[PDB]
Design a protein around this ligand. Structure first.
Ligand code: HEM
Ligand code: HEM
Lengths: 717, 717
């Protein structure tokens, strides 16, 4: 092998392949952003003329371009696929993927096999982005064009929201271990897909259209359709609704051999200006277009919304056959419906066709019942598709406070993890002072207050922006019962107390001022930190932002919140079972999800340890003699060359730090020690452990603690 | 099984290995900096009590720590080696390496074979870092400790200066293509070393202590020593002094088998807290320590400065032998000098020993004269060493204005590319204005004013902070001939015409307000843009900062200025022969050395292109119909889907852009088209190419233009 220049590959990771990669904590650096610092997209889009924008998109859709002629003279279907794939990479496990960042325009998504041709699809929309500039992001545009396509072809969508902010660097996400496109090394046991993956192969949006492993078995394809969609937050009814709804439009492309198609976008020549899959088959486009290799046209209404997909799916019997490219697909038996389906450009007319995956909707018992019902009651499909497509394109958007524009529906949706609207005057400076005092007099320890606040706030993840302290869901199922927040003998006592303080406060509250349990949880932690700081001799006030509301069990989808449970949280020195990598890597991943930087992650760990936020109050990493006190003892002791570390005799995970006598003075985990071992983390440790660092430590820690508490507060920004 | 989670392995470089890595323009990301944006190291170091620091460092040198006992009860020599290596990575070709950023404490330098044991060395200084904190960087401390060591042992140095700001992410540098430590794939023909390397093997700091590729030939070694040192700005006299000077102290370490030495820092276990090379021979420390594997104690006074090194080198005859770790080294023949050399821990006398490289000083003709002389004139050694040691430790400090503290000698040095101190008053806001109007009215073209100013300013490289427009060296020898600046042409005329403006203005305009040539070169450029701006409906005023002074050819070491010559500059669409990588990669490297971000670079290429700054007024990337007007026509045409790009028939690295009629409308190079092909750069282009970005392009272009013009102005910041 050979080492390359940094500009052509880089280094370090090359000498230490498994080396922890701290670049995960500084994704999308301000340095790479072309927009100013004062630039706020929300304020730009809120100004856009939606009506004018729709007409412009409608113009592109019906204005074919010679470098990629529009099937049936309408890029509409193409755009629906584009939007479906854009939001289609979403996974419920870590909440990554999705259309929220417009990652389809960057590697590796832009060059995924399943995304072939979408490069022309996006190029076609340049005229629009050009006209609206900064008032419209690609992320919003790539998916609004999909919504627009539907509406111009007869389907009334439920609504739409803008707010997706463009990024300038691709988000590095784990898509699997396969180093070969379409590879598959992600199954164990009885067809069990590895987490967090939500696709059956490397490079696909969901499943193989030719059936599992290319086996045209519709009944088997269904099991995979059911799971990958479930992992993309869609039940049986939504999955069926989505497939039918989409395949009611357009067609597939496979006019010729798939080996006449050149290299993907990221591997193509410069002269191709970012486009990929250049075909040498005939004209290489339009009538001779090759995308998937399949040559299917589901309905006789490619550019119109109607119940044809199902009338056709059930109207004929199917047989297995191949396309010009040699892929599996189905055609009506006995030459039925011959010459019934219109051609995209010329027009010899063709006969019905379906994908193995389309037949799963009729062969599978559950799907069959769903689509049968819609075969007889088409109105029901129209509805389900609306709800499902709305969800599909907005899943990773986060709190509804982020949906901007005149097309956002007013209705509340359970999958949006709803929170009640503020219904009273908010607590002010005086009230916030009083409560902090009432909470310090409640009897709750610093550890309990701090732990409860962290547990509640740290449930947020920047990927799909779900979770957080708003809603006060820490006292509802399933959070009240997570092992990490371990109720065993304390969380329940903290909740009851805060609830009493809320009760007593609201009844005595001044003129129409009331506080929520949700704010109390967070305020409790802020009150505890100020106390601890004083104990350490640092009179400081911890920022607090009121406004959180309390959600009810009924407004909280238990099953949906399952994915937010921490299987690991080094900030609390917690390591559950079944994580992909060792504890330290899991810490960086958590840090990533909380949107923390290396310094912030560092300051938080040290603070949390000495404050007693450790799971089960374990002594790991609690390198301090003090209690209830916010000091920098963690970093000072971590750099103490007087203590000798060795892995503990029994299990690993735990280490022992012996001193001179040979006695054990400290005990720590892989998370604790990595800060003293890693050359880049240590640098950050030598900063907060210096003699002049105590006051800076307290400042940064309080700032970071404040950032976590407000991770989910899009209502005030 | 190959692809890894981002938190571990990585991402996109994996599917596309030779992928243009833009992260080279995201170096040392602000978000990864724990100090805060308002942190001013200079303000802090001015606060430090240098005397106290020295005493605190002397107390470290004489206090032996149990985990790594001190040879002769003094860590001074160890600190000298630590410091020399800190600065000894500096390569002349790109100006990278050096002790400027304290990179020795990060990967990969912290684990290099040649940096073995320095891990304990740095650890020993933590107590000093602990006490001075933010007022003292590891960068200054590491190299300053080496300076203190020298002094404590009897050598008076020329002086020392602080100002090296610590960084929080390793600088990614190309150190060779070898994927094996100590490997060698860097030589061709008759000992020709591939640029920009300054070492003979991978992981070494100059040459191999046992001779070329392990061949103990002193005459051969000298060839490598002379060569590697030259690429580190040291000549024969300096090289000889440096070697003699350093080996006047300490010893080497090779008491047992190397195989008994554990993994390096970056690859060692967490419990080692950042230290590697844990040896299992004896105590793996002090008495039984192994570092290079060679066992040599050069003089009989390891912790004192005298002329013993040279008296021994010439006092005996040398025979080849082997250290306990089986390494080549020399001993005195006839068993002379028995027990005449002290043991680091009380053992009995040893015997005079030397490295093949030490014998190079006596066997090589040129070195021999140099050293033989110092044998009878130690005062000359002392003098040259001090000069060389000073240079070595500050080589990458940039303009002397950056030297901080009370130990900086005022003596002017030629290797610092001296610039006259401002002697007159500086042009005011009225004079500036008048001066611009004079230049605009002069008669030079925007393509001459803009191009020359760039030719001048772009000479700067952020690696060692050399180059820049200060000094008006654009009209002095080295630079005036550079093919890039294309001497054979208008360079002369503009120089001659600008000088005629300096005189006219200075000859008649008392008040003590006088202006230099250096400033006029830049100002003329700031005027050409204002004009070119207006000539596009934009009454704007480009920022200008006076203060540049005019150096003299005498104050300009021509050969030292050789390395700063561009072998390519995508900003002027210039490509010379001999570049390691294709034009696009060289474009990134250049932007890196100019300290530019992705957006800054983008806005800068599209800008210069339209102003006619291209090398030899070439039409490449000149996507505009307008003459010399500042518009984003470049970005707007590059995104013109109505143009088809195809490599020029003449395989001359150019491309053609034909319109609908099949006629050639534009021509461009790889550098021009990369911005429309690379998904991340095309994104930036799509920002500056929109209908609403015209005012932003100009605003951004100017900002980035102002930045390049000021790169070297440390005298005013
Ligand atoms: C079970 C999962 C699915 C599979 C295996 C699948 C497969 C495919 C394939 C192979 C094509 C042809 C691509 C080409 O060669 O151009 C296609 C096209 C398309 N699909 Fe799907 N699909 C699935 C789900 C969906 C969903 C849920 C939607 C709803 C938004 C959808 C909407 C579309 C549209 C609109 C096209 C037309 C593209 C065009 O006309 O150019 N698909 N699909
Ligand atoms: C021709 C270039 C040079 C070569 C090949 C070379 C090689 C070596 C080797 C092999 C060691 C032994 C390391 C160990 O095992 O502990 C050493 C030590 C040392 N060198 Fe050099 N060296 C060179 C130049 C220099 C220069 C220019 C200086 C002074 C600025 C210097 C200062 C030192 C010091 C102070 C030590 C001893 C550190 C201690 O006592 O632990 N060397 N060198």
């Amino acid at each position: 092998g050979h080492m390359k220049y940094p500009v052509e590959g880089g280094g370090n990771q090359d000498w230490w392949p498994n080396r922890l990669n701290l670049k995960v904590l500084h994704q999308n650096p301000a340095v790479a952003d072309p927009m100013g610092a004062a630039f706020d997209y929300a304020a730009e889009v809120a100004t856009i003329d939606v009506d004018a924008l729709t007409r412009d998109i409608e113009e592109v859709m019906t204005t074919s371009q010679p470098w990629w002629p529009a099937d049936y003279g309408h890029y509409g279907p193409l755009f629906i696929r584009m939007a479906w794939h854009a939001a289609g990479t979403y996974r419920i496990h870590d909440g990554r993927g999705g259309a929220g960042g417009g990652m389809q325009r960057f590697a590796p998504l832009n060059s995924w096999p399943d995304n072939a041709s979408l490069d022309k699809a996006r190029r076609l929309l340049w005229p629009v982005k050009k006209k609206y500039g900064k008032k419209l992001s690609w992320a919003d545009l790539i998916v609004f064009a999909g919504n627009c396509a539907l509406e111009s072809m007869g389907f009334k969508t439920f609504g739409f929201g803008f707010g997706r902010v463009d990024q300038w660097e691709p988000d590095e996400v784990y898509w699997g271990k396969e180093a070969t496109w379409l590879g598959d090394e992600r199954y164990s046991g009885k067809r069990d897909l590895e987490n967090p993956l939500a696709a059956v192969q490397m490079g696909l949006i969901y499943v193989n259209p030719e059936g599992p492993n290319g086996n045209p078995d519709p009944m088997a394809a269904a099991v995979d359709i059911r799971e990958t969609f479930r992992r993309m937050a869609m039940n049986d009814v939504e999955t069926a609704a989505l497939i039918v709804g989409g395949h009611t439009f357009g067609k597939t492309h496979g006019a010729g051999p798939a080996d006449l198609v050149g290299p993907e976008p990221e591997a193509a020549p410069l002269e191709q200006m970012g486009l990929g899959w250049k075909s040498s088959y005939g004209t290489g486009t339009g009538k001779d277009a090759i995308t998937s290799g399949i040559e299917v046209v589901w309905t006789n209404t490619p550019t119109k919304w109607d119940n044809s997909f199902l009338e056709i799916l059930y109207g004929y019997e199917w047989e297995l056959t191949k396309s010009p490219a040699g892929a599996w697909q189905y055609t009506a038996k006995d030459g039925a419906g011959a010459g019934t389906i219109p051609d995209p450009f010329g027009g010899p007319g063709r006969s019905p066709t379906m994908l193995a995956t389309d037949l799963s909707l009729r062969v599978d018992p559950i799907y069959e019942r769903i689509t049968r019902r819609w075969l007889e009651h088409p109105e029901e499909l129209a509805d389900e598709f609306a709800k499902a497509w709305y969800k599909l394109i907005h899943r990773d958007m986060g709190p509804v406070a982020r949906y901007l524009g005149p097309l956002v529906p007013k209705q509340t949706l359970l999958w949006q993890d709803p929170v009640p609207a503020v219904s009273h005057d908010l607590v002010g400076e005086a009230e916030i002072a009083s409560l902090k005092s009432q909470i310090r007099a409640s009897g709750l320890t610093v550890s309990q207050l701090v732990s409860t606040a962290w547990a509640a706030a740290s449930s947020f993840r920047g990927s799909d922006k779900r979770g957080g302290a708003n809603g006060g869901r820490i006292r509802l199922q399933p959070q009240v019962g997570w092992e990490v927040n371990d109720p065993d003998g304390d969380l329940r006592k903290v909740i009851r107390t805060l609830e009493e303080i809320q009760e007593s406060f609201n009844s005595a509250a001044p003129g129409n001022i009331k506080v929520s349990f949700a704010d109390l949880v967070v305020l409790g932690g802020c009150a505890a930190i100020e106390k601890a700081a004083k104990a350490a001799g640092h009179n400081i006030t911890v920022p607090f932002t009121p406004g959180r509301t309390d959600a009810s069990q009924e407004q909280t989808d238990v099953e949906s919140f399952a994915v937010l449970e921490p299987k690991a949280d080094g900030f609390r020195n917690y390591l559950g079972k079944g994580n992909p990598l060792p504890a330290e890597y899991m810490l960086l991943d958590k840090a990533n999800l909380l949107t923390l930087s290396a310094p912030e992650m560092t300051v938080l760990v040290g603070g949390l340890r000495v404050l007693g936020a450790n799971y089960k109050r374990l002594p790991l990493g609690v390198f301090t003699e003090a209690s209830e006190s916010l000091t920098n003892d963690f970093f000072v002791n971590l750099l103490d060359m007087g203590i000798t570390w060795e892995p503990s005799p029994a299990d690993d995970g735990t280490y022992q730090g012996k001193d001179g006598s040979g006695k054990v003075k400290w005990t720590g985990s892989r998370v604790d020690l990595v800060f003293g071992s890693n050359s880049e983390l240590r640098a950050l440790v030598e900063v907060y452990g210096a003699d002049d660092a105590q006051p800076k430590f307290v400042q940064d820690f309080v700032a970071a603690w404040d950032k976590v508490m407000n991770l989910d507060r899009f209502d005030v920004r």
